[PDB]
Design a protein around this nucleic acid. Structure first.
Lengths: 48, 48, 53
DNA sequence: CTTGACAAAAGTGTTAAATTGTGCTATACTGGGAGCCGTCACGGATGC
DNA sequence: GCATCCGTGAGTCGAGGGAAGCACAATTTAACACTTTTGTCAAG
């Protein structure tokens, strides 16, 4: 059934129990932003 | 200050490139429409 | 350059190719205004220390 | 807007002390050592 | 005709990665009493 409408899904749906792992790759450790910051010694370009 | 950013200038990486090429004993010179040298170092590397 | 031009009329193809290569180098040096002996360093330039910090 | 001192922060000579640069040591000694293949494969150029 | 030499081989990101003395002469530095100038405070 559809929780938003209460009407059923027009076709039967494969529903079961499956084992799912939460991987080490998280957006918390991957989101990054910068306006200004450190610069390189020689080229004076921003670091990485 | 709420203004528009100014027109940019020569990158520092190009200045580093020119200085390294000079260190290789290569006379790299930036010229103008009339083939006269143009100082991209703001007079900071010209011996008086 | 004059000798290379004169040798450029040799019937042999390899001789003309060698003359052409040597003459291209000579023409480059003549037109550029560079001197050949400038290819040997008497004073070695030293990079500014901030580029070699 | 001024002198009329004066505590003090700064500048000025010498000196004793670390700190640093240089020479010298006399039995005889006399040509290095780390190398070491999945050697990377493949075009482009020179040149014998 | 082959032999040899040389330059080339994707991008962004993170993650951790990080024979030696000894003596002696010069030289430099630290320190130290002294003259300063440099601020101040006092009234005129």
């Amino acid at each position: 059934y559809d929780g938003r409408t209460g009407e059923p899904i027009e076709g039967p749906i494969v529903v079961g129990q499956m084992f799912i792992m939460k991987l080490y790759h998280m957006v918390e450790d991957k989101m990054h932003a910068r306006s200004t910051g450190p610069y390189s010694l020689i080229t004076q370009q921003p670091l990485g | 200050k709420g203004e528009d950013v100014p027109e940019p200038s020569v990158p520092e990486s190009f200045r580093v490139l020119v200085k390294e090429l000079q260190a290789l004993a290569l006379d790299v010179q930036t010229l103008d429409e009339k083939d006269n040298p143009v100082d991209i170092f703001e007079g900071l590397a010209s011996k008086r | 350059e004059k000798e290379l031009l004169e040798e450029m009329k040799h019937p042999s193809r390899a001789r003309r190719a060698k003359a052409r290569k040597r003459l291209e180098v000579v023409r480059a040096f003549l037109d550029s205004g560079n001197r050949p002996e400038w290819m040997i360093l008497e004073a070695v330039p030293v990079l500014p220390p901030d580029l070699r910090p």
